[PDB]
Structure 1
C-alpha cells in the first residue's frame, strides 16, 4: 500500500505513526547525570556506517531490500547527503523550483535513497519501557521499516521525526530499512535559495523512555520591574498511568549549588467545565536576584525535571539549560531584560563544502567563535530549524537566535499561492508548531519566524496567532508580503536601503528611516536580510550602522550571509577547487548566487568581514582636543576585560604610545586625557589610532583580541621644503616613432603613434611588459553584473550599461603628443580620446615631467561625457616586468578596501607579500584595491600621490574572462592599476544597481597626479 498511496504526493499526509514533538530528551535515570549534562545510557547514537543503495524512483526498489541487505549496496557514513558521495548531482537553484511546479505532484523520476542498518538491541531495553528511533533530519521524505515491518512515514527535512519501535524489535540483531525520497509534496514548502540535496543528513538515535514518562515540559521565566526577582514556571506533562504517588520535582542549579526547588503531585488547576489536566503539573520556583542571560553575558542555570514517587524513587530525569531573560516589544522597541537591543546579526545556512548540509560540532563552534570575534551578537536560522546542538551552543556562548520554520514557497506565482490556500494549512501548521514544541526552552531563541519568502497568506495569520497564544514570551516575525503585515511584530524587510525608497507595487521597500514613521506605524524595524555580501561587496555597510545608531527603532539586522555555499570538486590531478551553481551539470541553475558569505566555505574571511567587525563595534569614540571619549554600547556588562591602546604616528612612523584600562558602565562614557605629544620636526600628517584590547582570553576569544578600533588625523605639517637642485638635465632624443628621454642609467620611451609611455629602463633592463595606459573599466564585480545573462540581458545592470556604451570596446585615439625641453626637465604632453561608434566617451590629457632628479611627475586630467554611464574607475594601468616578493604602502590597509567599504581600513605603513594583495573570490573580479594611498613601493619602483591601487599577477582582462578562481594563471610580471578615482562596489543587494550616488564617478571632470621614481 506504500507505493499505492503515494503519501509523498499528498500535502494532507505529512507523517504516519510519528510521535508528538517535544524538547530534547535523554531519559536520564540518574539526576546527577541530568544535572551535569553527561551522556545518557538511554540515548544511543546510530551515527555509524550504514548500507546504502541509490534508485531512480521508488518503484525501482526491490521487495527483498525490506528483508535482506542488497549486495550491490555500498557502505556509507551516516549522517550524509548522498549527492556528496556522488550518487547524483546537487542542484543549485535560487527561486525557480528544481521540479516542475504542479502541486502536489513531483517527477516520476524521483531519486530514492535506500538506507539500512543492522544493529544490536540489548534485552533490557525490550523487557520494560519504550524504545523509539529519532531521525533529526531526513531530506525530504521517508518510509521506515523495522525487521521487515512497516513503521511509518515522515516529512519536513529540518525537524526530528520519531517512531516507537518497541513492538518491532527483538533481542540481538535488528534491521532498519529507510526509503528516503528526494522529492515530495514537502518540497513545495522547501524552496530555499540553497543547494538542493537529499538523504539522512542529521543524527539518528535510539531513545529509551519508561512506560510512565515525561512527555513534555515548558520552562518560562517572569520578572518584576527591575529584574531583581524572578519566577521560573515549569509545566510538565506525563504519559502513562495516572497515580496519586507520582511527583515532579523541578530543581534549579547554578554550578553545583541548588538555588531553588519545587515538588508537586500531578493535576493541574481547573481550566474548564470538564476539569483540568490530571496528567499535567505546573511548578513555580522563586529566584531572587537571578543572573540574567544575554549575548553579552550568557548566564545559565540548569533545570532538572525529575519524575518520581512521593517516597523519592526516580523514574526518569530530563533537563535543560535555563537563561533568565525577558523579550518584549514596548513603545515600538524590542527589549531584552528591559533594554533596547541592537542586533548585530547574520543569516547562517547549514553548509559545509565537503559534507554538504551535514553539520558537525567542530564547524558550528568555529562559526560561533568567528561570529563573536567579529562583533556579531545574533543569528537567523535561514531558513529552517537548525541542528539541535546549534541552539545549545548559542545558549552557552551567547548569541540571540531567530528560529525560523521550514517554509519557503518563493517559486510560486504569486508567492502566496500555497500559503493563502487552506488546503496547505495542515502542512504549514506542522512546520511551525513542531518547531515551537522543540525549541521553546532555549533562552538563545528570542524571536520566532514563520518562514521565508512565501508571500503573505491567511495561513501565516493563523499560525502567527497560534504562536502568540502558545508562547507569549517571544515576538513573532515574518517578512513575506511586504515585511510589515499583520503576521509580524517587527518590521523586518530584506534589502531595504537606508535613505533610498524602492516603491515596488504592493511590496515596496521603503527607506528604513522612512518606514518607521509611516502613518500609523509603531513597530521596531530589524532587517531580516541586508548588505548582500556576494563577492566583492558590503559597500555602504557604514550607512546602515550610522542609521541603526541614530534611530532608536532601527534595531539592526542580519547580514546576508555568513558562509559561501561553495562545494569542493576535484580536477584531473586530484586538486580541490570551489564549485558553484551549474558545476555539477545542474540545470537550470543560478551560478555564483549561492556564494554570498562573509567567509569562504572553509571559513577563511572575505575582506568584508573586517568592515562588519568595525561597524558592529561595541565601543564608540570621539576626540576633542587631547580627550578621547569612549562610549559603551553594551547594555548589561561593564568593560571589565578591556584596555585602550593608543598610538600616534607620523606618516606611519611611531612617535608615542600608551595604554589605559577601560572602566565603562553599560551605556556609559569614559574620558581619557592623552598626554602632551612632542611636535615632530619633519613634515607630514600625524595620525592617532586607538584599539580596544581584551587582555584575558574568553570562551570565544584569545588573549590580546582586538574588539574595536578608530583613527583620527591630528596636526598636519605640510612640506614647504624645496627639493635639492639637480646637477644633471634629462636629454630628449626624437625619432618618428618615439620620444626618448635619458638621465644617467634611466631611460623613458614614449611611443608617438600611441602617445603612451611604452617602456622604461633602469640600467638597461626593461621595466614594462605593456605600456602605461588609461583605464576606465574594471573586471565586473558580482554587484556590477547582477542577474544579467548572455541569453537574457538586464539592461539596467552596471556591466550591461558599460558594455552598451562601449566602455570595454573603446580604443584610445591619439590627439596630441608633444615633447619640450625645459631648464632642468623634459616635458611630454599628450591628449587621447576614447570613442565608440562616433561617440567620444572620455578625453585624457596628460603631462609627464621628467626632471634631473630622475622623478617623473604625471598629471592627468580626464573628461567624462555626461551622458555616458559613469565609469568604473579613472586611472592608469601597466604590466611591470618585475615580480617582487613584498608590497609596501603608506595608505589604507592592511586588507582590501574600496571607497564605500574603507571605514575598517587604517592609515599606516603596510607591508604584505604580493599574494595578499589579491583576494581569491571564487568568481574572479576586480579585487585587492587599497584606497587613500600616498606612497606605494614595489621592487625598485615608488609611486607617490593620493591614489587607489591594486597589484597582482592577473590582468583585469583575465579576471573578466575567467569564471572560477582555480582557472586563473599568473601572468608574466605584475599588473598594476593606479586609480585617481574608483567607483563604489555597492551591495545593498546584488540584483539591481546598488552603488550610492556619492560613490559614482559622475563629476564629469577629474584630476589626479602621480610621481614615479626609483628608490
Structure 2
C-alpha cells in the first residue's frame, strides 16, 4: 500500500483526538492531578533496529525480536544514537521535491517492546496505546497483528489495542519511516531527525466513558462575574441513570458544582446530542488568569451513576480569562497586551528533539527571569507538558499547527491545492481538539511559511467557528491576508520599508496605517539573534510603547540548535549544519538563539531583559517617576534601590518601597545630594528588586534598572608638572624616547610604535597599528541559505587586504615632552581607502597621549571600526575598566549595559559564540586597566587571547587556540552589529561609520 506516499492517507484506525486524559477512578486524585493507575508509561528500554528502506525489514521481526537489534532508550531520535545522521537544512527540502513521493532509500526504524498487561485491564473496558510523537509516519503491529498507521510527527496518535492484547506478555512492533508525504508539510528550519521521540503510554478507559470535554469561561463587563461552561461527550451505552458532575475548585475550596443526566439541547430538525451534556457554573469574583498572575482553578469532570458510583474522572486546570480583539487591539481580560515574546523550538544538545521536564522548567524560568511573558510554539504543537507549565507558571502561548512547506515553489503550491486540504486539515483540527482547554494558549496559528492558499482560508474559518475564544493568526502570503486576525510579519523593520514584490515587509509603524487597515500588529518573528546580534532591539521597544496597535512580538529565537559531538580525545564540542556529513546543509543558520544549547545566556539576553522591563522611569530634578506597565498586579514584591556614584566611586544609596498600581505611577524623592569630594560625572542607577522568592524567581532577583547622568564637575585643575623630561634618540631606523624606566620605540620605516619597555621587559608582541576591519559577525556575512552583504562589500573594496603606506614620520622636542607625528595611507589597487594622521606626545610624567584623525573615502563602504590594535606581551588575570558593562555591548546594543567600574577575569571578556567572530566589545569606556597598563579616553575595546585574524579564519569555537600574549583592540568608533535579519544588510544608518572624518584620543600610561 505505500501509505507513506499518499497524502489522502494520513492514518489508519486512529482514534479521535481529545484533551489530555488519565481515566482516574478516584475523584480526589483527579482534583490534585496525582498520577493515575490507569495511565501507564511505556517509556524506558526498547529494542531497535535500523534499515535503509522499509523493503529491507524482515517479516520475522513482526513476530519475533531480531537478535541484531540493540536495546535503546525511548523516547529518542535515532540520529542521536548514531544510527544515521541528522541533517540541517533551512529552506530546501532534504529530499527531492516530487510530491507526494519520497526517496526509495528511506531510513526505517524498527522499534519493539515486550511488556506485561494485567488481566484486570482486559476483563473490562478499553485499552489504548498513545504515541505522543513519532517522526515522520509509522505502522503499528501488536502480537504480530497489524493495528494501524499514523502521520503528523507532532501530535499524539492513539490506537485501540483491546482486541489485540492478552494477559501477561505482549509484543508491540512499530515501523517508523523517516520520510513520508507528511514530510512535505514538515519543512521547518531545524535539524531533520526521526524516531519515537515523545512519550508512549497505555491508557485504560471504561466502556462507558468521557470521550471529550470542552471548558469555556465567559464574563460580564467588568469581569466581576463569570460562567464556566463545560460540554461533555461520552461514548459507550446511554442509560438514564448516568450522570455527569462538573466541580470547580480553587485550591482546596470547592467553588461550584453541577450535575446532569446526558441529553443536550435541541440542535436542528433531528433533535440534539443525546450523548452530550453542558453543565454551567456561576462564579462570583473569579480570580483571573494572566501571565502576571497565573491564578488557576481545577475543573473535575465525573462520569457516574445516579446511585453515586464513580465510573471515571477526567479534569483540567482552568484559567478564567477572555481574549478578544476590539477596536484594533488584542485584549486580555479587557486590557491591551504588550507581548514580550520569544519563538522556541524543542531542542536539546544531547537528546535532539526529545523534551524533558527539567529542560522545559529551566527554559520557562529563564524566560520569566528575563522579562518574557509569551512564547510561540515555532512551528508545531509541543509536548503536552509544555502547556501545563505555561498555564501554571504564567506565559501567553501561540499554539501552531505542524504545517510548513517553505521549500515549495511558489510557497503556496500545496496549501492552495485542494488535494492537500485533508492532510492540512488534520494538522489544524487535531491540535485544536487536544489543546483548547489550556488557558495559556491565547492564539492559534495555522502554521508557518507555507505561502497563502485557499486551504488556509478554509482552516482559519474552521477554527473561528469551533473556538471563538481565541484569535487566529498566520503570516504566510504577506502577513496581512484574509487568514489572519493579527498583522504578524516576520522581520519587518521599525522605520524602514522592504518593498518586496507581492509580499512586501512594510515598516511596522507604516503598516498599521495603510489604507483600510485596522488590525493589531505583533511580529511573529523579529530581532534575529544569530550570533553577535540584537543590534537595534531598543528601537522596536520604543515603537511598541509609543504605538497602541504595535503590541509587541516574538524574538527569533530562544535557543541555539547546536548539537554535541566528541573529538578524537572524547571531548565535547558544539556542532552545526554539515558537521554530521549532512549535505546539502545550511551551516550555522541553525543557531539563532538568545541562549546557547546548554542554556547559558548569550550577551543579547540582557538587552532583551532590559528592554522588556515592566517599570518605566523618568527623572526630574531629584524626583524619579516610576510607571508600572503591569495590567493586573500591583508592585507587591518590589522595592526600589538607588545608587549615586562619581566616576564609579560610590557616594550614596537608598531604598524605597514601590507601591504602584497597574498602569499607575509613583513619585520618589531622592535625598539631598551634598557635594562630591572631587571632579567628574555623577551617575544615578536604580534597580527594581524583588525581596521575596516566587515560583519563578529567587529572593533578591533584579527585574528592572535604569541610569542617568547627574551633575558633572569638569576638571579644571592642572597637572603638577613633571619632575623630569623625556629624551629622544634619533637614528635612521628609529625614534627612541626614554623616561626613567620606560622606553618607547617608533620604527621609522613603518611609522608605528614597535616596542615599549618597562624596566627590562618588552611590552609588545606586535606593533600598535590602525585597524579598520573586524572578524565578520553572522549579520556581516548575511547568509540564511548577497553582494550587498557588509562582508562582501568590505572584501570587494580591499579593506581586509589593505597595506599601510608611510607618508610621514617625524620627531620634535617640546619643553616638556617628545612629540612623534605620523601619517599613513591605506590603499588598495591604487585606491586610497583611509588616511590616518597621528601625534604621540610623551611627557615628563611618563604618559603617552595619542591623537588620531582618520579620513575615510566617501566612496568606500563605511568601515567596521576605526581604532588601533596590538598584541601585548603580557597575560594578566583581570580586566578592570570604567565604562559600560559588565557584559559585551555594542553601539546598537548597549542599553542594558551600565556605566560603572567593572572588574572581570580575562576570560569573561571573550564571548564564545559557536561560530567565532568579533566579540566581547565594551563601549563608552573612559578607563581600562590590564596588567601594568592603563588607557584613558572615550573608546570601545575588546581584549582577549584571540586575534581578529584568527577569529575570522576559524569556523568553530572549539578550534580556537590562545595566542601568545593578549590582543587588545581599542576603538575610537565601531559600527553597530545589526540583526533586524541575518540575511541582508541590517545595520541602521545611524550606526554606520559614514562621517568621512573621525577623531579620537587615547592616553596610555603605566599603573
Q: Under a length normalisation based on structure 1, what TM-score does the superposition of the two structures give?
A: 0.99
Q: Does the alignment pair 1:997 with 2:989?
A: yes
Match of residue 525, structure 1, among 521, 538, 541:
521
Q: How far apart in 2 are the matches of 1:777 and 1:156?
A: 48
Structure 1 runs of 4+ aligned residues shifted over 2 Å read none
Measure how far apart 1:727 and its partner are.
Answer: 1.9
CA contact 1:750–1:756 (8 Å) conserved in 2: yes
Q: How far apart in 1 are the matches of 2:145 and 2:788?
A: 60
Q: How far apart in 2 are the matches of 1:442 and 1:621?
A: 35
Q: How far apart in 2 are the matches of 1:922 and 1:724?
A: 50
Measure how far apart 1:311 and its partner are.
Answer: 1.6
Q: Does the alignment pair 1:961 with 2:953?
A: yes
CA contact 2:756–2:762 (8 Å) conserved in 1: yes
Report the secondary structure of 2:7's partner residue: coil
Spell out, residue by residue over 1:47-71, the C-alpha distance to the aligned partner (whole angstroms, 9 max, x if none).
0100000000000000000000011
Measure how far apart 1:310 and its partner are.
Answer: 1.3
Measure how far apart 1:256 and its partner are.
Answer: 1.1
Q: How far apart in 2 are the matches of 1:746 and 1:580?
A: 49
Spell out, residue by residue over 1:99-129, the C-alpha distance to the aligned partner (whole angstroms, 9 max, x if none).
0000000000100000000000000000000
Report the secondary structure of 2:600's partner residue: coil
Report the secondary structure of 1:441's partner residue: coil
Spell out, residue by residue over 1:557-596, the C-alpha distance to the aligned partner (whole angstroms, 9 max, x if none).
0000000000000001100000000000000100000000
Q: How far apart in 1 are the matches of 2:105 and 2:664?
A: 63
Measure how far apart 1:735 and its partner are.
Answer: 1.1
Q: Does the alignment pair 1:48 with 2:44?
A: yes
Q: How far apart in 2 are the matches of 1:738 and 1:212?
A: 98
Measure how far apart 1:610 and its partner are.
Answer: 0.1
Spell out, residue by residue over 1:682-729, the C-alpha distance to the aligned partner (whole angstroms, 9 max, x if none).
101000000000000000000000000000000001001101111211
Q: How far apart in 2 are the matches of 1:491 and 1:237?
A: 36
CA contact 1:788–1:797 (8 Å) conserved in 2: no
Give unmatched runs, 5+ long, in structure 2.
none
Measure how far apart 1:788 and its partner are.
Answer: 8.2
Give unmatched runs, 5+ long, in structure 1.
none
CA contact 2:772–2:867 (8 Å) conserved in 1: yes
Q: How far apart in 1 are the matches of 2:257 and 2:56?
A: 58
Measure how far apart 1:909 and its partner are.
Answer: 0.1
Q: How far apart in 2 are the matches of 1:640 and 1:681?
A: 38
Spell out, residue by residue over 1:141-161, the C-alpha distance to the aligned partner (whole angstroms, 9 max, x if none).
000000000000000000000
Q: How far apart in 1 are the matches of 2:742 and 2:840?
A: 15
Report the secondary structure of 1:59's partner residue: helix
Q: Does the alignment pair 1:903 with 2:895?
A: yes
Q: Under a length normalisation based on structure 2, what TM-score does the superposition of the two structures give?
A: 1.00
Spell out, residue by residue over 1:44-95, the C-alpha distance to the aligned partner (whole angstroms, 9 max, x if none).
0000100000000000000000000011000000000000000000000000
Spell out, residue by residue over 1:478-527, the C-alpha distance to the aligned partner (whole angstroms, 9 max, x if none).
00000000000000000000000000000000000000000000000000
Spell out, residue by residue over 1:801-847, the C-alpha distance to the aligned partner (whole angstroms, 9 max, x if none).
00000000000001000000110000000000000010000000000
CA contact 2:784–2:982 (8 Å) conserved in 1: no
Spell out, residue by residue over 1:950-1007, the C-alpha distance to the aligned partner (whole angstroms, 9 max, x if none).
0000000000000000000000000000000000000000000000000000000000
Q: How far apart in 2 are the matches of 1:511 and 1:807?
A: 32
Spell out, residue by residue over 1:441-474, the C-alpha distance to the aligned partner (whole angstroms, 9 max, x if none).
0000000000000000000000000000000000
Spell out, residue by residue over 1:908-954, the C-alpha distance to the aligned partner (whole angstroms, 9 max, x if none).
00000000000000000000000000000000000000000000000
2:486 paired residue number: 490
Q: How far apart in 1 are the matches of 2:732 and 2:238?
A: 108
Q: How far apart in 1 are the matches of 2:237 and 2:78?
A: 43
Q: How far apart in 2 are the matches of 1:847 and 1:75?
A: 73
1:801 paired residue number: 793
CA contact 1:78–1:201 (8 Å) conserved in 2: yes
CA contact 2:724–2:844 (8 Å) conserved in 1: yes
CA contact 1:548–1:556 (8 Å) conserved in 2: yes
Q: How far apart in 2 are the matches of 1:700 and 1:466?
A: 37
Q: How far apart in 2 are the matches of 1:48 and 1:862?
A: 66
1:148 paired residue number: 144
Measure how far apart 1:681 and its partner are.
Answer: 2.7
Measure how far apart 1:8 and its partner are.
Answer: 0.3
Q: Does the alignment pair 1:601 with 2:601?
A: no
Considering only aligned residues, what root-mean-square deviation do their CA atoms show, in Å?
A: 0.5
Q: How far apart in 1 are the matches of 2:784 and 2:308?
A: 70
CA contact 2:950–2:960 (8 Å) conserved in 1: yes
Measure how far apart 1:222 and its partner are.
Answer: 0.2
Q: How far apart in 2 are the matches of 1:83 and 1:243?
A: 51
Spell out, residue by residue over 1:738-792, the C-alpha distance to the aligned partner (whole angstroms, 9 max, x if none).
1100000100000001100000000020000000000000000000001189xxx
CA contact 1:897–1:905 (8 Å) conserved in 2: yes
Spell out, residue by residue over 1:833-862, the C-alpha distance to the aligned partner (whole angstroms, 9 max, x if none).
000010000000000000000000000000
CA contact 1:826–1:849 (8 Å) conserved in 2: yes
Q: How far apart in 2 are the matches of 1:680 and 1:278?
A: 82
Spell out, residue by residue over 1:200-226, the C-alpha distance to the aligned partner (whole angstroms, 9 max, x if none).
000000000000000000000000000
Aligned residue pairs, count: 1007
Spell out, residue by residue over 1:4-26, the C-alpha distance to the aligned partner (whole angstroms, 9 max, x if none).
x1000000000000000000000
2:247 paired residue number: 251
Spell out, residue by residue over 1:397-429, the C-alpha distance to the aligned partner (whole angstroms, 9 max, x if none).
000000000000000000000000000000000
Report the secondary structure of 1:835's partner residue: strand
Q: Does the alignment pair 1:199 with 2:195?
A: yes
Q: How far apart in 2 are the matches of 1:983 and 1:432?
A: 45
